[model samples]
Target: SMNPPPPETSNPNKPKRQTNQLQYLLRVVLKTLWKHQFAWPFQQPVDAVKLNLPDYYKIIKTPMDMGTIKKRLENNYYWNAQECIQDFNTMFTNCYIYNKPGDDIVLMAEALEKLFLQKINELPTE
Candidate 1:
């Protein structure tokens, strides 16, 4: 069929949730454009996995302030674990406001926390 017809019935009971599918599709298109237009070099790792130089550079050069950001995170939780967990949802929401890749945003936060804790562990608890 050259032209598909629209669905006959709309489910009234279904909850309407705002979705960014178009944005996601556009992002994929942009990625394709960037990959081709930039002519990003892809290197094979020692294990034979391919890596894109441009994407790797973008990831490596991404702005990250573990210390200051950690302090802010701690402050958000009032320096309490239970409180922090409860507030984690809101923290994610706030970070999502910047449209950062959700997985990266969460993983970066986790990485920051781990690094901060490791540094503290290395110090003499006098």
Candidate 2:
């Protein structure tokens, strides 16, 4: 009754999720990240307008970008959907770190982040 040192004969499959289906599902979500109307600031280095705030570099730790997230998701680099979403979340988090509560960028980040939450509901489980 010692678990028999892990019983195994012909079973070879692992606990890995369906990669192919995940890729397609995540890519669709990926499109939303890129195509978002408020995605401009996160994607462009122009910093939009009210972003040249003081101490931006000193405070922000995880300075992420849309392009960076896109590259990771597009290249089959992420192992799971949440990993990709976290990058986008980080992209927005950077704004909350540097940009103030009343700033447009902050608002955009909130809006886009909320949308992602909705998308997660539709996300299929493996």
Candidate 3:
């Protein structure tokens, strides 16, 4: 035949990300979560040394932050939004450990995480 072979109708081996509609909602919700004041404390990795919180590193085995989360999303590191949200939980749990109850940072974590939960709940499920 003169015509080139037809393009493949499906890519079963395509990366898991493109196949999930949840990625769109994840990006949008992440963008919104980053804009709130509650995000300030978590905008970057915690500077335990600079802030003089030596115990932070000792208590939190795996430190997670918003910057890392955003990069992971952009890099297609998450197979599903659940994995992304798992990172969020790690971040929030770290905050809870480093900061005492009633502390501002603890409160902020709650507020931002609550906002995230609301946004996730608002999304339509597959």
Candidate 4:
């Protein structure tokens, strides 16, 4: 009979170590959500708040107002549903820009969803 390969010498406690890592990942995801108080219109920079219009002009290029950003989602005359979906897909894809793992991606997606919901709640009542 053909000889079997020798028993591997890898760490015997790998399974238990893996279980600990899973627990740590879950804890990290939960902690991030708890600590950030996730929402849209994230805290502005100190300089952004203090700068005058002229100073601000120097820092921003092609500044689009809130109305413009909202227009992309409203008014059938301007909005294309497919384009909106594509933009959202891009948003999700960009979250992985650093080659993050699935657990981190899920956490990022959760924060994005919360931000989206907060923005929606701010829309005009009419």
Best-matching candidate per lDDT: 3
lDDT of 3 by residue, 1-126 (tens): 022232222344555573243575456667887999889878777776667777777777778888777776666665677767778888999899878899999889999989878887776565
What lDDT tens digits, residue by residue, belong to model 2 across residues 1-117? 011121121233433343643575456655776688888877643232255444554566456777665655555565676666676677777788776688887888888788777
Write out the backbone clash pairs for model 3. Answer: none
Residue 25 shift from truth in candidate 3, angstroms: 4.8
Tens-digit lDDT string for candidate 1 (10-50): 34454333223222212332223223322221111111123
Candidate 4 segments exceeding 4 Å error:
1-71, 74-79, 102-106, 110-126
Please say which candidate is ahead in lDDT: 1 or 4: 4
Candidate 2 to native Cα RMSD, angstroms: 13.2
lDDT of 4 by residue, 1-126 (tens): 222232122333433222322232224322332346442321221133443333443433223222222333222212233333343344444344323476654575557556544544443332
How many collisions per candidate?
0, 0, 0, 0
Candidate with better TM-score, 2 vs 3: 3
TM-scores of the models, in the given order? Answer: 0.22, 0.69, 0.79, 0.30
Q: lDDT of model 3 at residue 41?
A: 78
Candidate 1 runs further than 4 Å off? 1-102
**Root-mean-square deviation of each candidate, in angstroms?**
19.0, 13.2, 12.7, 23.6
User: How accurate locally, in lDDT, is each candidate?
Assistant: 0.30, 0.61, 0.72, 0.35
lDDT ranking of the models: 3, 2, 4, 1
Clashing pairs in 2: none
- Candidate 4 residue-wise lDDT at 11: 38
Query: For this target, which candidate reaches the highest TM-score against the unseen true structure?
Result: 3
